[PDB]
Amino acid sequence: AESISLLELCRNTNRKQAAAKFYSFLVLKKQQAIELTQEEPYSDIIATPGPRFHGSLEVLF
């Protein structure tokens, strides 16, 4: 299955952009487009497919 790291998505971005990517994980999780895993606080946030969206997560981001 397909997985996506927020910290990789955020490499070479500024604070506004990084925060917007973070906020998008919250929005996409509410809409059930993804699942979220964070092993421990302030560690990496991993996105995986969710029940309500089926296209490529890579392309989604």
Partner 1 sequence: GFLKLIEIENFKSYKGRQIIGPFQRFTAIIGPNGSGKSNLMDAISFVLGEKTSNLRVKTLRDLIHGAPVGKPAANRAFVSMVYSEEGAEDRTFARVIVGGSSEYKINNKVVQLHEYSEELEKLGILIKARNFLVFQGAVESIAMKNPKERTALFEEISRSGELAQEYDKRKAFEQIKKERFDRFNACFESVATNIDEIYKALSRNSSAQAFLGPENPEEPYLDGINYNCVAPGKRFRPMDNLSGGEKTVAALALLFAIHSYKPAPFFVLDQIDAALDNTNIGKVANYIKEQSTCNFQAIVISLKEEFYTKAESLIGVYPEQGDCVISKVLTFDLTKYPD
> What are the residues binding partner 1 (CB under 8 A)?
6, 10, 13-20, 22-23, 25-27, 29-30, 36, 38, 41-42, 45
* Count of CB atoms situated within 10 Å of the CB of 2: 10
Nearer to partner 1, 40 or 58 (CB): 40
- How far apart are CB 46 and partner 1 at their closest, in Å? 11
Shortest approach of partner 1 to residue 34 CB, angstroms? 10
Least distance (Å) between residue 32 CB and partner 1: 9
For every residue of 1-61, DSSP letters joined together read ---EEHHHHTTT--HHHHHHHHHHHHHHHHTTSEEEEESSTTS-EEEEE-TT--S-HHHH-
